């Protein structure tokens, strides 16, 4: 009676979606065929026969990565009307994923979401998995967040945006494909979770002792975080928190709604020994600078509204005991106007392991979702990567030729520059 659905726009959302839907079948005994040997109705509109198809719409412009799904192990799971493909990709071009080619199949996408809201009576929210890199994942979501607010408007719309790193970038027009996706979705997003590609490599290197992490392994860490946010629907816990409740505790203004996730503990199999990982210990591992999955220095700002999503055998006294240590500490300075900014959710499931993953089986976990202040310097970075590449008019001739104007680039920067004034608007102290 509470059903959330998921959309997989681009490729970086689709291969993360291969890590999510593999993982849900382990937490419920679901086969890849949909067979199983009662609260899993939040993701699976079932059939009168034995099969549990998922609630997922895989839209893609190029037919490349979808054919790995149509031929892989989870071929039999999905309904083959969900698996929507096309002919030519946007190819890192906002004007080929929002104006030219993305205009074509948009009436096959929304009409497919139309036939999934009728299998639901308690429709809950949206899960668009995408990235800010390409012009498909950040050029078609910007089209599609406009459309699902025309359809509903009053439903929660959660993204999981894979963030462009300050160290490593595998594109060239990537600071053009991020300023354009802000302006289009900022008036119709709900709460976009930032996850960085860079910071997972350090967590795979130091805390896990993996020197060769593949894209198979950077998505296992984003699999458990998405499994932790939606852990309160599929299971009964001590203090549950539904998806409609995230938009009020975490979003202080109609602009600042960019939380960065953080999972803990992350340990190797050999280091499951040698330590005990108490809730008073693993909570201090949340607020380290060395464990944040978006590369900033969190001791260079504040914290407007944190949020802790515990799970496993966790004592709610020791939660209060571990938190009362934290607000007494020195380095972790919250915001003056926020009195005390936590929203703690204790659930009754251990963090389940996937076979083949290099994560130890621990008895408890936490997915901190910290709306910090200091990430605006990382928003200040992707304007300095805009200004130097726009005074020389570099790479503009691909956008102009496919339906995009010159007037809409210094426009959205000033809109982004208005979003950068708002974080220093937070950092003031309105005294007396």
């Amino acid at each position: 009676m509470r059903e959330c659905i998921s959309i997989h726009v681009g490729q970086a959302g689709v291969q993360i979606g291969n890590a999510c839907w593999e993982l849900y079948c382990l937490e419920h005994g679901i086969q890849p065929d949909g067979q199983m040997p009662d609260s899993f109705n939040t993701f699976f509109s079932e059939t009168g026969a034995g099969k549990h198809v998922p609630r997922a719409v895989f839209v893609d412009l190029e037919p490349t990565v979808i054919d790995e799904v149509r031929t892989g192990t989870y071929r039999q799971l999905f309904h083959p009307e969900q698996l929507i493909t096309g002919k030519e990709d946007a190819a890192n071009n906002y004007a080929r994923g929002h104006y030219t080619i993305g205009k074509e199949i948009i009436d096959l996408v929304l009409d497919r979401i139309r036939k999934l809201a009728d299998q639901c009576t308690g429709l809950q929210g949206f899960l668009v998995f995408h990235s800010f890199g390409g012009g498909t994942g950040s050029g078609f979501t910007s089209l599609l967040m406009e459309r699902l607010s025309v359809d509903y408007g009053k439903k929660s719309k959660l993204e999981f945006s894979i963030y462009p790193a300050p160290q490593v970038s595998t594109a060239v027009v990537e600071p053009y494909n991020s300023i354009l996706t802000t302006h289009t979705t900022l008036e119709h997003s709900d709460c976009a979770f930032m996850v960085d590609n860079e910071a997972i490599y350090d967590i795979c290197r130091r805390n896990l002792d993996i020197e060769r992490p593949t894209y198979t392994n950077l998505n296992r860490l984003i699999s458990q975080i998405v499994s932790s946010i939606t852990a309160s629907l599929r299971f009964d816990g001590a203090l549950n928190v539904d998806l409609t409740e995230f938009q009020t505790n975490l979003v202080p203004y109609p602009r600042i709604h960019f939380p960065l996730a953080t999972y803990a503990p992350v340990i190797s199999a050999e280091k499951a020994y040698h330590e005990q990982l108490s809730v008073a210990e693993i909570t201090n591992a949340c607020f380290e600078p060395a464990n944040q999955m978006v590369k900033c220095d969190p001791r260079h700002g504040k914290y407007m509204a944190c949020c802790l999503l515990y799970r496993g055998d966790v004592v709610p006294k020791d939660v209060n005991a571990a938190i009362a240590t934290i607000k007494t500490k020195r380095s972790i300075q919250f915001v003056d106007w926020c009195p005390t900014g936590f929203k703690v959710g204790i659930n009754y499931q251990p963090p389940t392991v996937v076979p083949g993953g290099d994560l130890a089986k621990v008895q408890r976990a936490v997915c901190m979702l910290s709306n910090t202040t200091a990430i605006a310097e990382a928003w200040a970075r992707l304007d300095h990567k805009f200004d130097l590449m726009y005074a020389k008019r570099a790479f503009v001739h691909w956008y102009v030729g496919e339906g995009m104007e010159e007037g809409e680039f210094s426009e959205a920067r000033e809109d982004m520059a208005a979003l950068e004034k708002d974080y220093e608007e937070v950092g003031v102290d309105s005294v007396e």
Partner: protein, 107 residues
């Protein structure tokens, strides 16, 4: 007295090759009357891509241009030229000294 640790990094990491040959031959004769001053540091555009921007001395005075004088607070990191691998090596220091030779500014 670290003339060798900076001239090696002038023509291998910051201004190397045939492109800026006219540029780095300027900054040899500029410091010829200098280097009796003990230490000299450079400014670096970014810790990821080290490009040369300004040449300093340690007395912080610019001779070939950013700011004419620096403070300790606007310094991002303190980098050490790894001679064995022609790269940068970060430090835990916040003050100056014999160890530091490469500084990066903030914004």
């Amino acid at each position: 007295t670290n003339k060798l640790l900076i001239k090696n990094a002038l023509i291998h990491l910051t201004l190397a090759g045939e492109v800026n040959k006219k540029e780095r031959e300027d900054v040899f004769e500029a410091m010829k009357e200098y280097e009796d001053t003990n230490q000299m540091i450079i400014l670096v555009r970014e810790v990821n891509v080290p490009a040369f921007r300004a040449l300093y001395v340690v007395v912080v005075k610019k001779i070939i241009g950013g700011p004419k004088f620096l403070t300790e607070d606007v310094v991002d990191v303190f980098c050490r030229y790894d001679s064995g691998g022609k790269k940068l090596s970060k430090l835990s220091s916040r003050t100056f000294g014999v160890t530091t030779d490469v500084v990066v500014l903030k914004s």
